[PDB]
Design a protein around this nucleic acid. Structure first.
Ligand SMILES: Cc1cn([C@H]2C[C@H](O)[C@@H](COP(=O)(O)OP(=O)(O)OP(=O)(O)O)O2)c(=O)[nH]c1=O
Ligand SMILES: [Mg+2]
Ligand SMILES: [Mg+2]
Ligand SMILES: [Mg+2]
Ligand SMILES: [Mg+2]
Ligand code: NA
Length: 326
DNA sequence: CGGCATACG
DNA sequence: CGTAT
DNA sequence: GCCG
């Protein structure tokens, strides 16, 4: 089992679901306490289990696996022996965890804001609605739409949104293209949002594109919220039987020269990309981001025509998006 | 021990 | 700070 | 929390 998540296939569904979910609770809780290192370790340990070819049944099967030390091994041991890990269950029922989860789930509220509100004694969404003086316009929108945004986005919703985005993109700039990214590109059947990447085959034509796209979607009455650039974080009005629902949609524009890097970055998973960037820098001495791959000794960028090129330039076996579910 | 991914709004 | 459930 |  290799040590980096980008060195191994990780499918969306696997053979250690309960064990990985428990470790991910501990990772999430660490994040709520600002322990970024412990979050990373628990996420990595969970991801190792997702990559195994069969269920862990005995503690000896953890020997030699990367990212399993005393703490993660103990969590697994308790789950194998008793079906529950006491630490995990204490986290789950804690007022701190439940409130931090509720608050950070709001669009426009991160850990820092959630923690401040927690220390002020706030606990529920209605607590926040009572004091709108403390909310940014983005938070107000996230709070008004919280119920719809907490409802999973389905793959049928994605096809509908992609058509409306393509229509607006086509008027804004003929020839521009729309690619589905994020979790749905990795094969997820549901999501918290829909992610799209937009480019144009003629380098430079994509400049100024996103404002033109957003104005056109707004004119069609489809935008319930946006910030008004090359990235937009929107709430869309999506038709439903006899009604509609609010859906989070992210749009990114990239020049075609950068498209493979942007596609790779925005397809994720989040952990996969962190691991890939760590691997690039630490093992290969190259600096990877969603725009390119930089050799800091030669002071040159690697031209890529495909995701396949990027994996080759890092010396990694290619993984399709469905195997990037780290 | 230091390190832990990265950029835009 | 938020995007970053 | 774990790795090198
Ligand atoms: C949140 C986040 C995302 N990303 C990249 C990889 C993600 O897969 C991609 C899209 O982000 P998200 O839309 O937040 O996540 P997702 O689509 O993978 O899953 P879902 O929406 O169902 O919750 O952007 C990062 O590189 N770093 C981050 O911190
Ligand atoms: Mg997404
Ligand atoms: Mg998104
Ligand atoms: Mg230390
Ligand atoms: Mg997200
Ligand atoms: Na949030």
């Amino acid at each position: 089992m290799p040590a980096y998540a980008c060195q191994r296939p990780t499918p969306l569904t696997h053979h250690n679901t309960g064990l990985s979910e428990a470790l991910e609770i501990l990772a999430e809780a660490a994040g709520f306490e600002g322990s970024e290192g412990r979050l990373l370790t628990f996420c990595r340990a969970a991801s190792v289990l997702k990559a195994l070819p069969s269920p862990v049944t005995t503690l000896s099967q953890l020997q030699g696996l990367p990212h399993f030390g005393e703490h993660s091994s103990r969590v697994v041991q308790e789950l194998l022996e008793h079906g529950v890990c006491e630490e995990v269950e204490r986290v789950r029922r804690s007022e701190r965890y439940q409130t931090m989860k509720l608050f950070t789930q709001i669009f426009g509220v991160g850990v820092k804001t959630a923690d401040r509100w927690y220390r002020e004694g706030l606990r529920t969404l209605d607590d926040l609605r009572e004091q709108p003086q403390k909310l940014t316009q983005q938070q107000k929108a996230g709070l008004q739409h919280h119920q719809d945004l907490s409802t999973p986005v389905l793959r049928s919703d994605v096809d509908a949104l992609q058509q409306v985005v393509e229509e607006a993109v086509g008027q804004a700039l003929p020839g521009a293209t729309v690619t589905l990214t994020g979790g749905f590109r990795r094969g997820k059947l549901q999501g918290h949002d829909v992610d799209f990447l937009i480019t144009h085959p003629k380098e430079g034509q994509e400049a100024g594109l996103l404002p033109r796209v957003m104005c056109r979607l707004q004119d069609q009455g489809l935008i319930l919220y946006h910030q008004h650039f090359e990235r937009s974080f929107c709430i869309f009005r999506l038709p439903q039987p006899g009604s509609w629902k609010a859906v989070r949609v992210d749009l990114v524009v990239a020049p075609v020269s950068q498209f493979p890097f942007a596609l790779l970055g925005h397809t994720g998973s989040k952990l996969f990309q962190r691991e890939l960037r760590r691997f690039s820098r630490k093992e290969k001495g190259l600096w990877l981001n969603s725009h390119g791959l930089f050799d800091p000794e030669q002071k040159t960028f690697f031209q890529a025509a495909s995701e396949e090129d990027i994996f080759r330039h890092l010396g990694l076996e290619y993984l399709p998006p469905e195997q990037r579910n780290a």
